[PDB]
Structures are given as structure tokens and as C-alpha cells.
Amino acid sequence: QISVRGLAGVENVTELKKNFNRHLHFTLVKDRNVATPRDYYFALAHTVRDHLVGRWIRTQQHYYEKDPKRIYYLSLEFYMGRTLQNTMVNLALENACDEATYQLGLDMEELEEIEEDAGLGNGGLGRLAACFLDSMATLGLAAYGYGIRYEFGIFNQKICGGWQMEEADDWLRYGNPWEKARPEFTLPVHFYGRVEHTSQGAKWVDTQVVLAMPYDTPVPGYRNNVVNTMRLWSAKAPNDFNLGYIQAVLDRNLAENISRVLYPNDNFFEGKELRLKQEYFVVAATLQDIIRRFKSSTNFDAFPDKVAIQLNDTHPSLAIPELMRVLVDLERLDWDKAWEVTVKTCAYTNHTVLPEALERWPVHLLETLLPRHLQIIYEINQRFLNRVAAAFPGDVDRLRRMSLVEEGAVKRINMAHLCIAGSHAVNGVARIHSEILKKTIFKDFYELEPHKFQNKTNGITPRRWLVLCNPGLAEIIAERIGEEYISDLDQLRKLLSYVDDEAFIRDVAKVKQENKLKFAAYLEREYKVHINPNSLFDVQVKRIHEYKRQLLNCLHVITLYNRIKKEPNKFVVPRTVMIGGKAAPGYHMAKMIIKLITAIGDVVNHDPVVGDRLRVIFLENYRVSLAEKVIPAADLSEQISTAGTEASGTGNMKFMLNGALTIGTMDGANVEMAEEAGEENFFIFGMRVEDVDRLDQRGYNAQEYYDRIPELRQIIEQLSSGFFSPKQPDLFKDIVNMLMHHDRFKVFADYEEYVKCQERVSALYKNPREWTRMVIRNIATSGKFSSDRTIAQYAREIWGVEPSRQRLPA
Ligand SMILES: Cc1nnc([C@@H]2O[C@H](CO)[C@@H](O)[C@H](O)[C@H]2O)o1
Ligand SMILES: *Cc1c(COP(=O)(O)O)cnc(C)c1O
């Protein structure tokens, strides 16, 4: 069909067809008379899977032979999404499989929709890990992703009566064809117990044991025949466990609950024991696996030369004291030597500055669950503070500020401080974020060890986020500049010479229109809700959170509605405002925000006077698979977090690469995106970080904005009086009270500039040609945001390895 999808050779289509029938028969045990679409999906999955194994085996054999430095990316989250299409794309099998299934009388797109999203993540943090694995494989790095195989991933969101309802994500229900259980590599993980101090060394004894069983999933690079591994651990109780008889067997669930479910929190720390167990579980099993692999390559001096461990935030921070524990207690290395090795091996990536998201574990918890680790942490702290005291003599406050141990109500361990002390590199995820780290929360550490601090601006993989979700766009681009850009996104700059090309302008606009039509259709198919494909698609999809300010968007929507009601027969650019995202189950305000959005839709979407000029839709169950559908269809990307709160953001990059213009604050990567495309091609508004600080020094008083802005006042009064909740007049009292008295994110402060900016957006949309030309300028300069660039920087500046675009013989 289209170029970028590979060749549909005669021999290969024939081979695919026979292997498809072979799996349907032998693997699924079905014939064409009783097979269902799901059976066909699996038949296709196994067929595509077969093409991976050969490459997977030799890639691993290759690393064994050449023994390069290994990169271990530790994360409690890997938001992978679907695997079928991504695998076909990276193996250049998409057209062949499309043809083969066509000849078999099947629609491949229909089959792809059957695959369950592997939702082992909450949002940006987990998705970043997924994009990183894709880039590391594409850049030929000997990398391994290590995490937990949650039985239940992020919950499926159902909207009932306008409220979010959560239901278990039983993603393994029908089986997972992509994983390979490796029970032979099961490892023991210890919990509780006590520490015994003997003649030579301390011993951790009387522990409870939980087995870690690994499941391997292949990670194919883009057309380079490299297939890396993502190893996820599953909790298994030993067989002598708790060994009435029946109860003992049933209680095995206690130990196995460790890998049962993903904590559904995005940017929020919840200090629960189960979560701590998950964090240690992944770290303990992973480190043993890493050391075992290292030994089969005594000389731990070379350990840092053959191993790099990247900590995705502080979630796997226990890797530092666990590594020390193994080297000191088990390998018998002297402390100083063990510490040198640990520091040179570990690197830490910070993803937030929000106080409520930073991990601070109560000492009593570590004391009971991991007694030896607590002792090691105290020793690390003692030695670290001695270094601080020597560098800043007499500065007693600095000592207490930098301590890994926080005193107060209950003593806690600041995991971020632990990570900085035990890592040779600490990085932020966007230029502004990394600067904020050095100027604020990590200022003391930066002054002590400036060399440790770096920046690694985030990125997204252009395979899943362009070729896979937007083939139409990838095609018209390839038509002009070739396919090389798919693994070298910087080449998109060549599109700048087509900004005045009438044919290209027309094609770019055509692709967007087609995507919108397709999405508008999908909305009626699976969700039954009519929308106007000719309107501007204004979308804000991301987790629901106060700092992301979906509320600011809500205020704008109500403003638009009130303006139409005031002057009904006045022309306004038609808009379809789409907001989607999940709220953490225990985050009350976030759940109230979802209700507000649907409530607004209830009024706006049924007002005769508004007509098809304004529609407000809440996109249910936003997840990776849905992102692949809505992002290509978007015209306007809402990235409106309060300046200084969104460390980077990555959804912003996805929209830019897919032809949407951006309206946003100078926050996270938005700053670099605007810098790359040129501020004139971006819709920037609101306070800058400096303005926010000025407001805080003076004191934020929302009442002031309410008193000076009539339109804002009207909105608040509508919310308070029950205009959007007739049967329950005070339903949104908590929202109004927060907005008026304790809004940490200054929604009102950016209201005026936001509305004004939105007017300039509508003005430009009225001029199709100029809107598209600005779009081209954005797409053409989105190259810097490829995770290939991000990974290449991590590789060279942190891991000490060189990326390679060399194909392996297939
Ligand atoms: C903590 C934490 N939890 N989620 C995040 C997210 O991680 C993403 C990838 O770096 C960033 O782009 C987001 O701004 C950050 O909020 O940080
Ligand atoms: C990319 C992505 C995110 C991150 O979006 P931001 O707007 O940066 O918060 C979250 N969820 C999903 C499903 C994504 O694909």
C-alpha cells in the first residue's frame, strides 16, 4: 500500500500465510469454521513473533561474544502499549502482513485492535522507559530493561454518571504471546529478618524469602536486526512456604501479592509497605541477575567498565545500598572499594520537583522490612556528611539540609539525597528542569559536586509516534526526503524548504483531515458521540492533576460557551474540545475535575443555541493505544502546566511531531520546543518561572483576579450556584473553594493571557494555508525530540558507550 511499510514480496507473503495457518491450527487448535477475530489476532502475533526469535537469539549470543558494557535501565514502570504493529514496523513486515492477511480474507487493522495494551505504567515516566528501550535497541546498545510484571496494570477507566469508575486491568486474561517465561533463572529475594554481627562481617538472617521469576520480552530495534530484552520479575512463593495445610497454601498469596498490581499514582508518593516491597523486589532480583551475568563474562574494579545502572527516578533507589550490601557482606570488599564501584556504576534521573512526589520513607518501615539496608544507609549518610562538613566547615544547617535522614515527627529517609550521594551522574529531563534542580531542591548538592549534575532533555520514539500511528504523514514526508529520517529525525529540518511548496502544504493538510475523519468515526463506533470533523480539534490528554491544570482549560471552555450565549449570531471558529486522562483512585480533586468536565459537556453539548460550534468531550480510558489515535488527529495541543511544575512533558513532543500546533506555558520541554521551532510558531502565554516566584514572594491572592475580571467572576458564580449541576447545586464547592483560597497552581493568574492567546489560535485557524505552514515549521524542527538523540546523549555523557547504527546479520 504505502512505501514506508516495506515490501510485500511474493515469497514472504506466501510464507507468512502458511505460517499463519500453521499457528491457527497447531498453536490455537482451531479451524477457519470456529476461529474468532481474537484467534486470528493470536495467529498473526505468533507468526510475527517467529520472525523475532532468530534475531533475538543471535543478538544475545552477539553480546556474549563481544562482551560490551551492559546498560541496565531500572524502572518500576514500562508503559509499552501494544506490541504487534510496533514489531512489524521495526522488522519491515507491515505491508507483507497486510497483504498476507488480505489474501486470507482478513483486515489486519481490525486484528490489531484486539491486542491488549501492556499498561505497566501510569503515564509519562513509564512511557519514557518504553521509548528509551526502543531507542537503545535502535542504537545497538547492549541494554536491558528491568521491571516488575504486574498482574494488573493501570486500571481501565469507565465513566459512569460523569464519574470515573475503576476496573481491574486483567491484561493477561487471554495470555501474552510476546513474553517468554524463564523459570530457570528464578532468584530468591529476602525480606524482614535481623542483622547479626559476627567475627568477620555482618549477616542478614531469619529472613522471609520470595522467589523472583523472570519473564523476557523482546525489544526490536528499527530495521537493524537487534533485539534486546526487557526482563520483568514476577513474585512466587517458595514451596516450603508456611509449611492448617489448606490455609498455608492459600496464604501463598501474601508473598505473591508483591507483583500483583501497579500503584496507580502519577507524580504522587504513597508510603505504603507493599510499594516498598515492590521497590526492593525489583532491585534485589535485578542486581543478582546483573552480577551473575557479569561473573559469566572476582574483578569488581572492572565492574563499572562492564555495567551501568540507570535509576528511573528514586523508585529503584535501593539499588545503591543493595549493591553495597552484596559487595561488602557477600563479596567481602572493603567499604571504600565497594562505594567507589557503586558510585561509578549508578546514575540517577530525577523527574519532578513536586514535594508530594518525592519519596521519603519512614525509618520504622525500613527498620522492619530491610534492617541491613537501613544500617548501610546510615553509614552512607555518616560518611557523606563528613565530606560536607569538611567542604563547608561550621555550616551546620547545610548538614541537616543535606542529610539522607530527615528528623521530625517520624524520621524518614530522603531517597533523592541517597541517589545523589551514590551516583556519579544526576540528570534532569528538560533544560529548565535541570536548572531548577541546581537552583532549588538540589542546590546544596550541586555546590558540593557540580560535576555530577547534567541535563538530558526527554524525547519520544519516532517509530511508534510517527510511522506507526501516523503512516499517512510519514509517507508524504518520505516522498520528499526519503526514509532515513525515521532513525535520524534531525533530517526533518529538510522539510523547511517545502514550507512554501503548494503541493506539500496541501498534502500535510489532507493527512490531518483524514486523521480527524478517521478519529471522528472511531468516536461514534466505540463510544457513540457525534462530532464535527471541520472544527478545530483542541485536545488535552494526560493524567488528571492539579499542576497540569485541566481546570484552566475548563475555564476557557466555559468562557467560550458564555460568549456564544451572549452573542449567539456572532461567528466563532468551531471547536471540539477533547480532554482525557485518568485520575489516581485516591486523588479526590482529580476525580472532581473529571466530573466537572463531563458536567460542562452535559450543558454545552445540548444547548441548541451553541449548535455544532462547540463540543466538549471527555476521552474515556486514555492510554497508549488511544494516544496513537487522537494525537494524529489533533490541531491544538494543550500543554498548560504552571511554569516550573512539569519537569519535561512528552505528550507535548508527540503532538508537535504529528502536525498539531501548541498552546502552552514556558514549562518543561515546551521551552526547548518553542526554541527549536521559533516562538512565532508557538502559542506561548502565561507566567514564566520567575513570575511565579515573584507572585509567591508577594503572596498569591485569587480574590484579586476574581474582582478584576468580570468573565472569570461569572464562571465562578455559575459553578457555585449550580449552573452545571442543577440537582446538586453545591457539587463543585470544593473546586471553587480550592480555586479561591488554596490554589497552589495559580489557575486564575494565567486565565487572562490564556484566553487572549486562545483567540490568536482561532484567528490563525481561519487561515488554513498559514495554519498549515506554521504546522510544517513545527514538524520540521521536532527532530531534537527523538529519544534517539536523548539516548545517544545518555550513552556518551553518562554510560560511556558509543551508539551504533550498524545492522546485524539477520
Ligand atoms: C516522578 C514522576 N512521575 N511522573 C513523572 C513524569 O516523568 C516524565 C518523563 O521524564 C516527565 O516528562 C513529566 O514531566 C513528569 O511529570 O515524574
Ligand atoms: C505520552 C503519554 C503520557 C505523557 O503525557 P504528558 O502530557 O507529558 O503528561 C501520558 N500518558 C500516555 C498514555 C502517553 O502516551
Curated annotation (Swiss-Prot):
Known catalytic reactions: [(1->4)-alpha-D-glucosyl](n) + phosphate = [(1->4)-alpha-D-glucosyl](n-1) + alpha-D-glucose 1-phosphate
GO CC terms in record: skeletal muscle myofibril
PTM remark: Phosphorylation of Ser-3 converts phosphorylase B (unphosphorylated) to phosphorylase A.
E.C. code: 2.4.1.1
In-chain residues carrying the UniProt-annotated modification Phosphoserine: S3, S403, S487, S720, S721
Entry protein name: Glycogen phosphorylase, muscle form
InterPro entries the UniProt entry points to: Glycg_phsphrylas (IPR011833), Glyco_trans_35 (IPR000811), Pyridoxal_P_attach_site (IPR035090)
Keyword terms: Acetylation, Allosteric enzyme, Carbohydrate metabolism, Glycogen metabolism, Glycosyltransferase, Nucleotide-binding, Phosphoprotein, Pyridoxal phosphate, Transferase
Pfam family, one: Phosphorylase
GO biological process, one term: glycogen catabolic process
Gene3D superfamilies found in the cross-reference section: Glycogen Phosphorylase B
Residues holding AMP: D31, Y64, R292, R293, F294, K295, S296, S297
Modified residues (Phosphotyrosine): Y192, Y215, Y446
Native species: Oryctolagus cuniculus
Activity control: Allosterically regulated through the non-covalent binding of metabolites, being activated by AMP and inhibited by ATP, ADP, and glucose-6-phosphate. The activity is also controlled by post-translational modifications including phosphorylation.
Enzyme class, first EC level, given as a word: transferase
Gene: PYGM
Alphabetized SUPFAM superfamilies for the sequence: UDP-Glycosyltransferase/glycogen phosphorylase
Marked site positions, Involved in the association of subunits: C97, C131
Subunit structure: Homodimer. Homotetramer; to form the enzymatically active phosphorylase A.
Gene Ontology MF: a single term: nucleotide binding
Cofactor: pyridoxal 5'-phosphate
Family: Belongs to the glycogen phosphorylase family.
Site (Can be labeled by an AMP analog): Y144
Function: Allosteric enzyme that catalyzes the rate-limiting step in glycogen catabolism, the phosphorolytic cleavage of glycogen to produce glucose-1-phosphate, and plays a central role in maintaining cellular and organismal glucose homeostasis.
